[PDB]
Symmetry: C3
Subunit: 289 residues, 3 copies
């Protein structure tokens, strides 16, 4: 049986990125939909549960994506709600790379910190997109005190409240409208993550290298100019004085390996669910080696 991946994207069109990685991860064919909503996804899922039986069921799987974390969560829940009994296929959520990237980045930082970040302070700059929101979630699950920042308080609050409802944690929000406010927000922090939109600097060199409390910084933006000044994108725990840095390509290598591995697993059973909990567990295992 051909391994068929159905890609349900909440954006207007399906992500190109997710298509390439789906093929490299083991799908035989990818069929993508945009504009997916909780209401229209049920009929799509029906197509995955009424077309194959027995051993063949596991050769169809579902991937949910898009650029709005909360919307992706709602579509993913609607997918799971449509299943019943043995009428199900494996499914994965990874809006904008949120789960796979955050899992890779947080796993790498936690490992570099010695295996625990409990009680330490983490600041996620521009944390209101999918990647920042999943980063905040995973850091809070590791027991860090997390501040999720954005240019406008209410959008940062909505992101933090979404994280707190989905993960039963207590991330706090802060408004950092400009460079000076972002530089103030990292003072006293132990860990800083930059999850800004592509091709933007959020944290200049002088805003982190002189802050004694900061132990590790991590940047997800791969397109120059990098999210963090004073680092290289390939950094993977590189030392800068007494601090360490992870750049977007250092994180991205693990994110890609993890994403590809999850795709393959979608076709190994008809019962898999790949979201933050499972993807982060796998990321920590992969970071060990």
């Amino acid at each position: 049986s051909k391994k068929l991946l159905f890609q349900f994207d909440t954006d207007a069109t399906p992500s190109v990125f997710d298509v390439v990685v789906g093929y490299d991860g083991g799908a035989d064919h990818i069929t993508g939909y945009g504009n997916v909503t909780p209401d229209n996804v049920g009929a799509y899922v029906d197509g995955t549960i009424y077309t194959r039986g027995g051993k063949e069921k596991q050769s169809t799987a579902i991937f949910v994506g898009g650029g709005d974390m909360a919307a992706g969560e709602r579509v993913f829940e609607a997918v799971k709600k449509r299943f019943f009994g043995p009428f199900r296929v494996s499914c994965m959520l990874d809006s904008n790379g949120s789960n796979t990237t955050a899992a890779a980045g947080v796993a790498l930082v936690v490992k570099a910190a010695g295996g625990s970040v409990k009680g330490k302070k983490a600041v996620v700059l521009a944390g209101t997109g999918p990647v920042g929101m999943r980063s905040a979630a995973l850091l809070a699950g590791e027991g860090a005190e997390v501040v999720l920042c954005g240019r406008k308080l209410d959008k940062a609050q909505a992101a933090a409240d979404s994280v707190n409802k989905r993960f039963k944690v207590n991330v706090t929000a802060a408004e950092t409208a400009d460079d000076a406010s972002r530089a103030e927000a990292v003072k006293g922090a132990h860990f800083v993550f930059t999850a800004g939109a592509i091709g933007l600097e959020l944290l200049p060199q002088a805003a982190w290298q002189n802050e004694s409390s900061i132990e590790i910084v991590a940047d997800y933006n791969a397109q120059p100019p990098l999210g963090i000044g004073g680092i290289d994108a390939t950094d993977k725990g590189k030392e800068y004085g007494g601090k360490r840095a992870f750049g977007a390509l250092g994180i991205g290598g693990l994110k890609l390996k993890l994403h590809r591995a999850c795709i393959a697993k979608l076709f190994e059973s008809s019962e898999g669910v790949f979201d933050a909990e499972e993807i982060y567990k796998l990321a920590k295992e992969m970071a060990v080696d």
Copy 2:
């Protein structure tokens, strides 16, 4: 040459169901379009008739689908109108499973009735969707007196009039707004089909098991609660007193085999046309074995 199926769906997006079955039926690649109309389909068909020659022509084919039977018919006619001379590929119409499901269900019921339903009365409840409309068509072609019912008279009339124009038959329409009216409509019938939308009961157990005239009931809805009360979805002629029942999975197994077989045939010549007439002929042959 790769076997390329072009899926032209009248709905906003192409059916997932039809993608899976197309791959399992023998397509190498499926490319799907939504929002297809009689006006925009011609340029799509041009892409199928000007790109390959000779032996390679039969390796491209067209599948038309969607949720509106009349719209599917009009797109399918526009496909056939665009062809000329040897500039053609094989084509299939199966909006919402209408042809393949109705052919399977009617073939199974006709066989169970001894090979003829001529002169007997058939009632199609919720018969205004594609499946009910093709069921009514095939029953009328077998010489049954058919009543096509829906909640509102005018929509039922439009469905019956569409059937009668396409098939040159004389199906009649009836309004059955609620349970009590549906129960009245089956009185005196020999055959009852339920073609309601997914996950709805249309005919409770008490509304058919005490009607002496009813010989066979058939339900297309596979999602609980089933369209007919008092039966199991896997029933395939199971006896209930002096009556027999076909459930959605009993019908669906044949529908799937038939749909897959038609896909394979699309690539065996560049001249095939698969609609009710051909699909029902094949269904009756397949039901024999």
Copy 3:
């Protein structure tokens, strides 16, 4: 690695034609987008440059199409603008077959004319679509005096001005509102190309066969009635008195071979750019044999 072609079409949906030829030309999978614009294409390109490394980069490529030449040019420039350093894949522009068809047709006519059309007069009737616009461009690059005609002066001027800006040439525009005006426009011409929309005659037999200056005529329309009266679609330099004619199928055979060859080349490196200049160079080489 699977050879993945990403098809970015400026029309509402991706061209079926371009899908078939992409598969026959060597793509393993084609994923198509409509409604592509210079603003939304960057994120699509990101998916092609951040997902594969090293030897695998060349196994992803981009194809830009659609029915508006100027729009295709702008999307293609936005694709190239998104690349940086080694972060790139091969790309091709062929809106509506413009480059591959014009290259085939012009290469065949130039060859039949003895290898040069410098200083001669070429008229492109209905030259405002992608095919006519690229034909005018290539003829002007060969040193012909080109008049690009359409039913309305301003649309013809916009097409000529687009050609002149992209190719640094000096095509002129003319209004030919009807048959009589088109017949007047070809008087004194040496070469006449008909690039009208499908299924339309633009140049009746009597409008070219009695014009002593005309040496070669070429018609791109394959659907009867042909763009030029008095010729056959398979003509490939067939003599009519002292003149020669190329019909749409004579041109189309080379266009198809050329288009397929370009697709294969997209996967031979991650640095290829296939637009008028490169495609015409290849067409002239292919026409030699």
